[PDB]
Design an enzyme around this catalytic site. Structure first.
Site, short mmCIF file in Angstrom:
data_model
loop_
_atom_site.label_atom_id
_atom_site.label_comp_id
_atom_site.label_asym_id
_atom_site.label_seq_id
_atom_site.Cartn_x
_atom_site.Cartn_y
_atom_site.Cartn_z
CB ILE A 170 -22.88 -48.65 -35.50
CG1 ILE A 170 -22.08 -47.98 -35.13
CG2 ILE A 170 -23.81 -48.02 -36.17
CD1 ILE A 170 -20.52 -49.34 -34.51
CB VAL A 171 -26.01 -46.48 -30.58
CG1 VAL A 171 -26.50 -45.07 -30.32
CG2 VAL A 171 -26.32 -47.71 -30.23
CG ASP A 177 -35.37 -56.23 -20.45
OD1 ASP A 177 -35.59 -57.38 -19.27
OD2 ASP A 177 -34.90 -55.71 -21.26
#
Length: 298
Positions: free
Chosen positions: A45-46, A151
């Site tokens: 979760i943020v 990435d």
């Protein structure tokens, strides 16, 4: 002749103990308050919290360690975020363990991701140069420390409210050294991966320059090359075909075409370095943060 088992095999408790050696001691709820959730899944979760001492807003990523399937990449990432800091890299202030959760306390950026821009607006060359300059400064710094992002893509480029550009999400990063100068792992997001990585050849920092070039094509055409094809099919074309070109050569300046030609080079030893690209005439077109603001959704 003692066999120590790989990090995927060790107990959850010894995965946590490994992390405990590289995170900050203590409990961040001592100095942070007013947690509001702003994002979720699949590992955690943020939240946005407020630092009690200062009133500063921070972002806190809370990840369940029992749900981590890439334990070693997480471990490697946490060290990098701890040790390396740069104005064009989203900063990790500190990390902690709270129970079975890894809490990563990060700078709170409110400008969204570059993906939202390239999929809905048409960036000008000033704006493209501004993004490239910011990313190349980050790479200049990181590459000199032996860090490979692996990435790079619009999704991993975040913006401040005032239009500054920061490289984020080091979940796939690697660190090379004099002892182990090259990596060999097949890692990245298919359409942005360098040919040598897809060929499983030993590689270094040069792979980020290719991925950057693909992101430039995102900023020009809205999507990376071969995005209309399946990822594994796209990867075959990257590996075996001549470098991808923009859709309409005549609608891109000579200077930006030249810049792109230095990045999308198949042979890594002939590909431009971040250091070399910083001196390219294209980047003299870069503007201030104010030139990015009109692109932003708000």
């Amino acid at each position: 002749n003692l066999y120590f088992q790989s990090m995927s095999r060790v107990s959850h408790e010894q995965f946590r103990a490994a992390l405990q050696l590289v995170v900050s001691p203590g409990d961040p709820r001592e100095y942070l308050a007013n947690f509001i959730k702003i994002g979720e899944g699949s590992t955690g979760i943020v939240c946005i919290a407020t630092e009690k001492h200062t009133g500063k807003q921070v972002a806190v990523k809370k990840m369940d360690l029992r749900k981590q399937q890439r334990r070693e990449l997480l471990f490697n990432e946490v060290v990098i975020m701890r040790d390396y800091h740069h104005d064009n890299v989203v900063d990790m202030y500190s990390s902690y363990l709270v129970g079975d959760e890894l809490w990563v306390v990060m700078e709170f950026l409110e400008g969204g991701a570059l993906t939202d821009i390239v999929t809905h607006t048409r960036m000008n060359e000033e704006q493209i140069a501004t993004v490239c300059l910011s990313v190349l400064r980050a790479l200049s710094y990181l590459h000199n420390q032996g860090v490979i992002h692996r990435d790079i893509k619009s999704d991993s480029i975040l913006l401040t409210s005032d239009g500054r550009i920061k490289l984020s999400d080091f979940g796939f990063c690697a660190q090379v050294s004099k002892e182990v100068p090259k990596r060999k792992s097949l890692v990245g997001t298919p359409y942005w991966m360098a040919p040598e990585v897809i060929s499983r050849l030993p590689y270094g920092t040069e792979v980020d320059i290719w991925s950057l070039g693909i992101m430039v094509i995102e900023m020009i055409d809205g999507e990376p090359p071969y995005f209309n094809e399946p990822p594994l099919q796209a990867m075959r074309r990257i590996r075996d075909s001549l470098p991808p070109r923009v859709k309409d050569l005549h609608k891109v300046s000579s200077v930006l075409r030249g810049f792109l030609d230095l990045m999308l080079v198949r042979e890594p030893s002939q590909r431009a370095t971040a250091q070399e690209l910083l001196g390219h005439p294209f980047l003299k077109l870069a503007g201030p943060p104010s030139c990015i603001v009109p692109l932003m959704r708000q």
